[PDB]
Ligand binder design. Structure first.
Ligand SMILES: [Zn+2]
Length: 544
């Protein structure tokens, strides 16, 4: 009966979805699907992060409007996520009217409350193009080793780091012009004002221990004010009362979580839910699934901005680690930098969903996709443990018993062992201990296959007068399958649909307390096929 708003980080609009994104969106989707199974009101919200200088420049290079460009990438992203069955209630954009109005509102409130500071800064400027240059749009000669054609604040030959103002013979990446230092007034959010509140949240015990520890490092270094403005030319929202100034993505990106929810409420004609979820007095829960690299932002800047503008703050942050492939960071040269779209040409979504889920936990630790292990694990667990219980038993039921399951459980004690596990497995899904949940489910699958082996239906089937025994054994196996697929429903949506078609019933969490007795099942082709290393080799080759 809880009200829950869950987000994933907003994908950047100038890059395709890859396996790293998928770790995050799959983790969130599994959790969301479980929460829905337990009867809660869930709103799963995301959007593309569509503003900024890189996006403006990319569109100019392509000779199209930034609006056309981000629209095309939004569609590409949503197609990929739909391919993996990520069950958003809304997927919006930071380039939207809802986000504009909320960004303006929040800024206005921050300013009225004394949290916006004005400061003049100096930055490299391209006088030919007529724009300030972000660091990575400045190139030149390393001041230390004198290597040419180095970009931004570091040299890829000697490893030195420096301000781009130290580059020798600097050039604009945009125009080739020599950049010069120029002053500009910027607006800053007074994050340090919120230090005590943030420190109290850190010690409150809600956050992951690893996150709280990192936060202590940040408090120790000392909180800084953060620039929330950019000069024209820009692709984004103009700041009221400040001609030629725009909101930097730091301000408008997370407000996209709010804008996406407002968009959903407005499309639904729901005039009460936005305030019910975002006002200070809210009894709804708000959760953000995010990666390591955006924790400072979500744990410090974001709750401060919300407090300073009279909105509720996150109930919790759920942080995951990086994805690796074959033990290492994704590598383009090795073909392990793998796009979501590419993945689906070779494998189904369920396979990756399962593999990631089996490795995930409540900690921040990197998650490794070892491709050899992926083949082994999917075949061993999905094909040979879980689906096996249906595939080894359904034929006899269909061919010899007209599709009808036995009128009573052959082994009620064993069935009770399976249903008794619901509390611990659900608690594991709830606490994000996904690996624990999968281990418990697979231990049950081992018990189920041990039961079938003990009963030896391939022997019973050939022996005169043992029809009743055969129906009993096979029906028991199918009932164990029903339970396991219920526990795995958040993980494997497509296999679940196929299982529900076979069983002639929707799988509900509470439904397992009533086994299927005197009940017609349907024939099926093949619920889940084996994979092989040849397919992996093809995936890698296609990714090079
Ligand atoms: Zn160098």
């Amino acid at each position: 009966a809880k009200k829950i708003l869950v987000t994933c980080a907003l994908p950047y609009a100038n890059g395709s979805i890859h396996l790293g994104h998928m770790l995050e969106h799959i983790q969130a989707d599994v959790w969301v699907r479980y929460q829905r199974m337990r009867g809660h009101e869930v709103n799963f919200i995301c959007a593309d992060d569509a503003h900024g200088t890189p996006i403006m420049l990319k569109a100019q290079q392509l000779g199209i409007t930034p609006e056309q460009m981000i629209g095309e990438m939004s569609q590409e992203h949503q197609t990929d996520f739909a391919g993996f069955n990520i069950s958003y209630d809304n997927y919006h954009s930071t380039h939207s009217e809802e986000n504009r109005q909320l960004s303006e509102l929040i800024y206005s409130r921050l300013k009225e409350n004394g949290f916006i500071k004005n400061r003049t800064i100096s930055q490299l400027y391209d006088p030919e193009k007529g724009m300030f240059l972000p660091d990575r749009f400045v190139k030149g000669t390393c001041p230390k080793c004198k290597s040419p054609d180095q970009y931004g604040d570091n040299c890829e030959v000697c490893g030195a780091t420096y301000s781009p103002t130290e580059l020798i013979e600097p050039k604009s990446v945009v125009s080739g012009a020599t950049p010069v230092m120029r002053d500009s007034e910027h607006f800053f959010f007074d994050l340090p004002s919120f230090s005590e509140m943030l420190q109290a949240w850190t010690r409150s015990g809600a956050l992951q221990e690893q996150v709280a520890n990192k936060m202590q490092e940040w408090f120790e270094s000392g909180l800084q004010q953060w620039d929330i403005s950019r000069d024209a030319p820009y692709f984004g929202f103009e700041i009221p009362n400040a001609p030629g100034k725009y909101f930097y993505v730091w301000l408008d990106a997370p407000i996209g979580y709010m804008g996406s929810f407002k968009n959903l409420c407005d499309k639904r004609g729901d005039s009460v839910s936005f305030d019910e979820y975002w006002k200070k007095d809210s009894t709804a829960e708000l959760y953000h699934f995010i990666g390591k690299d955006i924790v400072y932002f979500h744990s410090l800047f974001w709750p401060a901005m919300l407090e300073g503008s009279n909105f509720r703050k996150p109930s919790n942050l759920f942080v995951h680690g990086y994805v690796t492939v074959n033990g290492a960071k994704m590598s383009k040269s090795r073909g392990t930098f793998i796009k979501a779209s590419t993945w689906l040409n070779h494998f189904d979504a369920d396979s990756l969903r399962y593999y990631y889920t089996a490795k995930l936990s409540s900690r921040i630790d990197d998650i490794d996709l070892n491709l050899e292990d992926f083949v082994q694990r999917v075949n061993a667990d999905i094909v040979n443990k879980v689906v096996n219980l249906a595939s080894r038993n359904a034929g006899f039921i269909n061919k010899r018993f007209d599709g009808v399951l036995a009128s009573e459980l052959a082994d009620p004690q064993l069935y009770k062992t399976f249903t008794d596990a619901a509390e611990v497995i659900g608690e594991a899904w709830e606490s994000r201990e996904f690996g624990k949940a999968v281990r418990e489910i697979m231990a049950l699958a081992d018990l189920a296959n041990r039961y079938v082996d003990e009963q030896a239906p391939w022997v019973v089937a050939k022996q005169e007068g043992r029809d009743a025994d055969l129906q009993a054994i096979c029906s028991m196996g199918i009932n164990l399958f029903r339970v396991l697929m219920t526990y795995l429903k958040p993980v494997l949506p497509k296999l679940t649909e196929r299982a529900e078609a076979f069983l002639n019933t929707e799988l509900t969490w509470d439904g397992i307390q009533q086994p299927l007795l005197g009940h017609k099942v349907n024939p099926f082709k093949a619920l889940y096929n084996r994979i092989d290393m040849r397919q992996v080799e093809a995936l890698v080759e296609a990714s090079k």
